[PDB]
Each structure stands twice: as C-alpha cells, then as structure tokens.
Amino acid sequence: DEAEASKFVEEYDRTSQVVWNEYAEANWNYNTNITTETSKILLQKNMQIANHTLKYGTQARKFDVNQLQNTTIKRIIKKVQDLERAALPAQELEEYNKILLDMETTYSVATVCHPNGSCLQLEPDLTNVMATSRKYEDLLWAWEGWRDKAGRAILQFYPKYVELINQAARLNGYVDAGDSWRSMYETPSLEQDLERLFQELQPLYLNLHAYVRRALHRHYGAQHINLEGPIPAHLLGNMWAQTWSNIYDLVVPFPSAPSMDTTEAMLKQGWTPRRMFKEADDFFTSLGLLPVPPEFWNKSMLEKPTDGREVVCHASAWDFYNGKDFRIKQCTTVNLEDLVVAHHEMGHIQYFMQYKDLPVALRRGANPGFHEAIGDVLALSVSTPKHLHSLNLLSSDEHDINFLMKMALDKIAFIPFSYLVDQWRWRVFDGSITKENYNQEWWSLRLKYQGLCPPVPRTQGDFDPGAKFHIPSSVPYIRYFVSFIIQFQFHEALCQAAGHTGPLHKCDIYQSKEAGQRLATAMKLGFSRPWPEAMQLITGQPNMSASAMLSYFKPLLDWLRTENELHGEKLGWPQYNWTPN
Ligand SMILES: *[C@@H]1O[C@H](CO)[C@@H](O[C@@H]2O[C@H](CO)[C@@H](O[C@@H]3O[C@H](CO)[C@@H](O)[C@H](O)[C@@H]3O)[C@H](O)[C@H]2NC(C)=O)[C@H](O)[C@H]1NC(C)=O
Ligand SMILES: [Cl-]
Ligand SMILES: [Cl-]
Ligand SMILES: [Zn+2]
C-alpha cells in the first residue's frame, strides 16, 4: 500500500543522513591524509554504511514499486533496491573494498624517479613537464615513466575489481557494471544518442587534429610526425592528451597577434589558490546564486599540504549530506588551467546547496553530466578575453581566431577522449575485452577516436588505462563527455536569456540574474525528475544537442577548413597502422 511506502521513504531519509554523514568524514580523512590508521577506519565505516544499505535495501525490495501511485515515492524506493557493493557476501565485500583502497593508494603515492636523484609526483611535477617541456625525449621520459609506475602496478588489482564490481551489478539486476553505470542516465537510447553527438563533432575535431599535427610536424620534425598518421600521444601538453591547451605556443594561428602569459600574470599580481576560489564564489553570487557557507572556508583543503603526508590530489567536491557542510579537495596550482577547475568544483558545491532541501536519495544531479557542467558553464564566461582582461590576466579578428583556437584545444580535443574512456570500460565490463586485451584494445580506441598512437610500442605488463585517475578510482567517465556537449547548450541558452546578441563565443553571462534563475530552478529539481525536464528548464528543449558547440566554434571551423585545404592536409589517419621509428 501507498501509506507504508511513504513512511519507509521518511525512515530511510533520516537514517541515511546520519550514516552518509559519518562516511563522508571518514572518507575525507583518508583522502586528505593517506595513512594506515585512517585507511582501516574507512574500511570499517564501509561496513557500517553497508549494514544500513543492506538493511534498507532488503525492505525496499519487499515493496512492489509496480503498485505505487505517487511517482516521487515510487522513484526513491526503486533506487534503494540497488544495494551496490552491499549486495555482495561479507568476504567478497571486504575484498572489493580493500582492492579499491589499494588501487587508489597505488595511484596517489606513485612516483617517477631519476637514475639516483629526484623523485617526481604526478602533480605538479609530471604535469608541469608534460605542459612546458618541448623536448621529445623528456616528454617521453615523463609519459613512459608514469605509465611504468602507476599503470603497471594497477594491473594486478584490476581483473578481480572487474569480477567483483560485475558481481555486485548482477546481484542488483544488471548484466554488468557498465549497464549499471549507464542506467544513471535513465535513457535507453543513450549509446546511440552519444554516438550521433560524437559524429556531429567529427568534422570539427578532424580539422583541429590535422592542423595541430601540422604544427607538431613543424616543431618536432618530419621524421617524428606522419602527416597522414596518428599523433604521438605524448606531444599534446597533457599526460593523457585529453586537453591540448598547453601546446598553444606551438599552434597559435596568428602569432602576429600575441597574448599575455596568464600564468606569470597570476603569480605576479599575487593570486593565491584561496583568491582563485574567492573569485569563483563571486561569479556565482553575481548570478544571484548561493554563496559558500563560512564553514566551507574553514574546513576545505584548497592547497597541497607541506606535512609530508600523502593525499589524493585529483580535484573533488564534497557533500556531507548535512545541508551545512560542503568542502573542496584540490592540489591547486596558480595558473589559468586550475582557475577553470576551481570554477568546475564550485559548480558541484552550488549544486549541493541548491538541492539540500530534497531527500538524500534525490540529492544528485539531473544526470551525472549535469553535475559536471554547472561550473564549466560559468568558466566559459570567465575564459573570455573581456572577462580575463577585467581580471588583468590579458590585454580583433586575429585575436578572435586565437581565442577560439585556445578554447578548441581544451573543449574539442576532449570530446574524443571523454567518449573513449567508457567505450573501453563498458567493453571490459561486458566481456568484450579481457585482461590479455586491456592495453591493446585501449590503443585501438585511442587510434580510432582520438587519432593518437603511443610514442613507444606497448609491451606485456602494460596497463596504460591504470595511469588515468578515474580507472583505479572507479569513477565513471561518460559524464564529462555529456558535460562538454551540454555546457555549450547551457551557455547558448543563458546568453540568449542574458540578452547577448552577436557571436556566441563573445558572451559573458556575469551578473545576469536571468541566467541565474534558469540555473537555480533546474538544480533544485536534483534527481526528482528525469533529466530532459531539467534540460528543458534551462534550454527550452529536452534533447542533448551538439548544435550549440558547433555554433560557438563555427568561426573556427571555417578558418580551419581553409587553412587545412591550402596545406592539402588529409583529414583523419588513413594510415592507422603508423607508429614512430
Ligand atoms: C508525492 O509525494 C511527494 C513527497 O512527499 C510530494 O512532493 C511534495 O509536494 C509539495 C507540494 O504539494 C512540496 O511542498 C512545497 O514546499 C515548498 C517549500 O520550499 C513550498 O514553497 C511550496 O508551497 C510547497 O508547500 C514538497 O516540496 C514536495 N516534496 C518533494 C520531496 O518533492 C508530491 O506532492 C506527491 N505527489 C502527489 C501527486 O501527491
Ligand atoms: Cl594512455
Ligand atoms: Cl556517469
Ligand atoms: Zn567534476
């Protein structure tokens, strides 16, 4: 009956708040202080939260969701029936929790050392080398070295991780873990929807690829770049070649129109990692959206500590399911790239504050992609020359194509990589890719989608996916692909609401209450309604669409077509078999 069902939801909500609150603190202390004490406290708080999940998930399965009128009640109960890892028998649950902890630690503490000297960490050392070095062999030292230490050591944990995470999914009614992850979007046509979105950005990516390949051919020499083959994976300014903005000096369309060194501008004018978040806080409030509580500033780790303690550096935002406690954990470097990431993480916090009045089971994004997109939308406005100049970090047709090129190196280059990652994982989860095919099938997709090849031939024992944070940390990736598509849809819609006329890329939504109002009401929905409703609240239409992204970059697509045609470039990589000598 309906009456017992709403009572159960109320009971679940109160008990979840307390137990979810306790787990968050226990997880925080490990993430901000990797030791042995905090690790086993987390392993024991894992059993406490699993008891709650098992207890209430059993009760939920005794409810026939099928016989329930109120859809909000119907929705929550259906979610509680999913136990996740808690569905596993005790021995396998503790094994699975240990493996995850082992993988997360292995990744976070891994270092790449010189013959008998300095040992380098991923952030900021190896990140800095990948971004600034222009020597082929030095970049290779960092690229290979990171994969030799982080990737290779993850390989031992991964098959059993796949086995146990799939087992949990089967016990919760799914065929495998990929199926379980995809269900978060509540869209039966998701795979075909994502494929069509990817195909629509092919002409824009292939033109950026061909142009960047030409620029690399210019600098690294004809012997190391094949203008009809895939680009060596280590030359794009980033460890995973997911974003390419750091090789801007190598690709700048009009060097005739030069732009400020934005990193040294920040360091000189006295930009603290604290001021970087303070300015991101200002942008949100200018839209009429909520400020971060005083408690946020007291308890957040906005900078890498000098204790000598190990930490999880990857940027993340933290909801304590309290309605009062919200935190950010980030190893912030003072540069433009981390200012964007600071806005991204503040977007998560805003989403937390907007739906804190909802039940905890519904305290979630419309879909995971929505949660990632909020900060990135504001960052698009922050990234404009007009907003950056007003922050004294910069000082028109040539500057216009340059800016669009800068944005393309991040936004466009990430489309194929963000698509790639879960294309690999889903096939790993469903059995298409086994442990003897992990690395081979990873590079097949690197070639197929990104048009990248490894700089060094891959050997047995290589597990390059393990050198990317999200893989050993078991964090789904397709969200970022959705985010990059939809953030431009949000941008377009918020700019038309702001009354911005002219080219989309010159829009700055700063201080627009109309743009804030559309964001607010959509975020307030949380996970109460299917995402097409939240999409419609912001954009006036319910579909994911690549139109807004192509509109934004339309001036660049025309310029690239002309430029690549006059060089007689071949779009794509007809010689997919090509690897370096
Ligand atoms: C199914 O059950 C759900 C949850 O019990 C009902 O949703 C609730 O609906 C009421 C309005 O009927 C919402 O109350 C509102 O609160 C705000 C306070 O900020 C106030 O300004 C409004 O005037 C209103 O009173 C309440 O938020 C909402 N709760 C949730 C969790 O969504 C729903 O009405 C039920 N559906 C049917 C068809 O009976
Ligand atoms: Cl890789
Ligand atoms: Cl996701
Ligand atoms: Zn995020």
Author numbering: 40 to 434, 439 to 624
Give sentences from the paper:
The E403R mutation was generated to investigate a proposed chloride channel, where Glu403 may act as an ionic gate mediating access of chloride to the chloride 2 pocket. Furthermore, whereas Glu403 made a salt bridge with Lys118, mutation to Arg403 resulted in local disorder with a higher B factor seen for Lys118. E403R also presented less contact with the surrounding residues by the loss of several hydrogen bonds with Ala400, Leu401, and Arg402. No water molecule was seen interacting with the mutated residue despite its solvent accessibility, and overall, no conformational change of the main carbon chain was visible. Thus, E403R and the N-domain lack this stabilizing salt bridge and show lower Kd(app) values for chloride binding, suggesting that the chloride pocket is in a conformation that can more readily coordinate chloride.
Somatic angiotensin-converting enzyme (sACE), a key regulator of blood pressure and electrolyte fluid homeostasis, cleaves the vasoactive angiotensin-I, bradykinin, and a number of other physiologically relevant peptides. sACE consists of two homologous and catalytically active N- and C-domains, which display marked differences in substrate specificities and chloride activation. There is also a smaller testicular form of ACE (tACE), which is transcribed from the same gene and identical to the C-domain of ACE. ACE activity is dependent on chloride ions, with the degree of dependence being substrate-specific.
